Amino acid sequence: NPSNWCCVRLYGPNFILQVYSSQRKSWHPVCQDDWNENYGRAACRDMGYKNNFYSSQGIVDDSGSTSFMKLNTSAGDIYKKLYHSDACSSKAVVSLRCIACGVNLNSSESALPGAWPWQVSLHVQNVHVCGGSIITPEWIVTAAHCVEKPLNNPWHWTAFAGILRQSFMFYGAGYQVEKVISHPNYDSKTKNNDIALMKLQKPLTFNDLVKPVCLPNPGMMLQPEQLCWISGWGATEEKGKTSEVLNAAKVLLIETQRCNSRYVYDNLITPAMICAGFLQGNVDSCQGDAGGPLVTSKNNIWWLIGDTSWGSGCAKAYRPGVYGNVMVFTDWIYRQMRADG
């Protein structure tokens, strides 16, 4: 069963390549020893990124792990070759980035062009219905409740990227969506596991206005109330209509423990959820649309921490926004990307 199986991951803001040790219950970094670009592309294809490959180099291990994985100097799949070595010869572990992501417009309300190049508007019947985040030239992260029946068919959806104004999303200009995959454990009753993937029929052309956001790795080591950003065409006022122009705002993460308080959401926040906003209220984080991006800046990289899931009203006290926890979905996303190609 694919869920029971795992293998490989990227850990931390420095993309430390980690392999799981059969029967030892543990992750181990990889020695730079005899590593090259081909091995990095192999690991990326193992994670489901296909021919995508950005960089691979040697960095210092900051995870504090027990042992490393060193490829047998010559054993003749090279995957088994990696045995439990106590140290690396090159004194360096493998940093591997499979795709150029997390970069936007440097600092220089209404969103600026290129400020959120991963933001996409998802339309049905020529009308902006949801938002999403670019992760590959052909893959978009959104919410599962956006694509529930009867919108589970990919032919209902068109994606618009690099465009800030809805009025400038004309009939014909958006990329057709080929596949829609809801999370298998999505529960519309509780909005648990509210995440879905859209694969486009045609690859996006990346530029200053259209770029992907990095998927979050385990061990990001974010602050308890880490400052994050939300963006979208979300109605600023309740019951309001879709904002014509793209907007963005800053929010702070809210501890899940504090978010599950009785006088907040009273144990409705699951491990598949994170909370963000402001508890006291009065702060307009309503700009975001459902499935839109929740991102944070760490190690000078923009990471997708959450996708807009649910929330009682908006800018309401004791009712912060609840987002899907992309960190716990990154493996499922990798699996879906690998199973496609």
């Epitope: 543990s26 504090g64 990001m220 504090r258 599950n260 699951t270 491990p271 994170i274 960190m327 716990v328």
Partner: nanobody
Framework: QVQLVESGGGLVQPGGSLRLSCVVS????????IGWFRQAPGKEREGVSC????????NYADSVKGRFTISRDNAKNTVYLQMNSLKPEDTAVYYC?????????????????????WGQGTQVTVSS
């Protein structure tokens, strides 16, 4: 439903050993750090040990450093705390708690507010 279930507590002689176990349900250990905390009678809850989502990162408070040992079984979704050379000072209610991996896996000082999910705990008393 997510549950954390502690067991293995009991009454033991000073210098004895115990093995606490914590069964985790509702989420994967690959994305969450698991800590053992203890609360003495009428004292604040203090961090005892921590194992990260990677399984290699382990941290221990100086009061039990080198005497206790935390471990995890991902296949069994069970975290074990081996308490060796138990002292009367170790008498407390031992709780199992889970924190996400978005934040730091294991800290030197275990902040109980970073841990989002809690079990009911098991009583450990170390006396003659």
């Amino acid at each position: 439903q997510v549950q954390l279930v502690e067991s293995g507590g009991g009454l033991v002689q000073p210098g004895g050993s115990l093995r606490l176990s914590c069964v985790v349900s509702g989420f994967s250990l690959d994305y969450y750090a698991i800590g053992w905390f203890r609360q003495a009678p009428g004292k604040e809850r203090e961090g005892v040990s921590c194992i990260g989502s990677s399984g290699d990162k382990t941290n221990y408070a100086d009061s039990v450093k080198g005497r206790f040992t935390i471990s995890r079984d991902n296949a069994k979704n069970t975290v074990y705390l081996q308490m060796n050379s138990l002292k009367p000072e170790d008498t407390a209610v031992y709780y199992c708690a889970a924190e996400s991996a978005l934040y730091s896996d294991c800290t030197e000082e275990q902040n109980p507010m970073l841990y989002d999910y809690w079990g009911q705990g098991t009583q450990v008393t170390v006396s003659s």
